[PDB]
Design a binder for this molecule. Structure first.
Ligand SMILES: COc1ccccc1-c1nnco1
Ligand SMILES: [Zn+2]
Length: 140
């Protein structure tokens, strides 16, 4: 689990969104596993605006933050797992690292702020849903 709280937005994995998120929907995209809902209180997370490929992510299944190199946001095949079917996911970045389903929502951060959230895993890779292209999270 986990979310990004920027301005009056809450950013979550689409597959973990709650009824409240859907009842306060701003934007969602199945292809990216992202959903954004509106918040009553202002958040303080800063979204990275950059093309960094190094950062640190939170892995809840190890209670650890790991430094990682990560790839460019791309359209990648995600294999079937115990709880989820095989599908293509867009705006996905991969790193070599540990990820289990319950790690979804863990923050990836660089020196510029939040890059994205854990979204996929398998075969010793961790996949992150990028948010750095969603420039509107910074306004309105
Ligand atoms: C961090 O995510 C995973 C790690 C391992 C296996 C599957 C997943 C996953 N796939 N879709 C959602 O979670
Ligand atoms: Zn950066």
């Amino acid at each position: 689990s986990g979310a990004i709280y920027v301005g009056n937005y809450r950013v979550v994995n689409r597959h973990l969104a709650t009824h409240n998120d859907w009842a306060n929907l701003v934007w969602e995209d199945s292809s990216r596993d992202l959903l954004v809902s509106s918040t009553t209180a202002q958040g303080c997370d800063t979204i990275a605006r950059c093309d960094c490929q190094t950062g640190v992510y939170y892995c809840s299944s190890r209670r650890k933050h790991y430094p990682v190199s990560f790839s460019k946001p791309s359209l990648i095949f995600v294999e079937a797992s115990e709880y989820y079917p095989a599908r293509y996911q867009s705006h996905l970045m991969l790193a070599v690292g540990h990820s289990e389903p319950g790690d979804c929502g863990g923050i990836l951060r660089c020196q510029h702020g939040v890059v994205g959230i854990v979204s996929t895993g398998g075969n010793g890779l961790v996949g992150f849903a990028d948010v750095r292209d969603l420039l509107w999270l910074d306004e309105e």
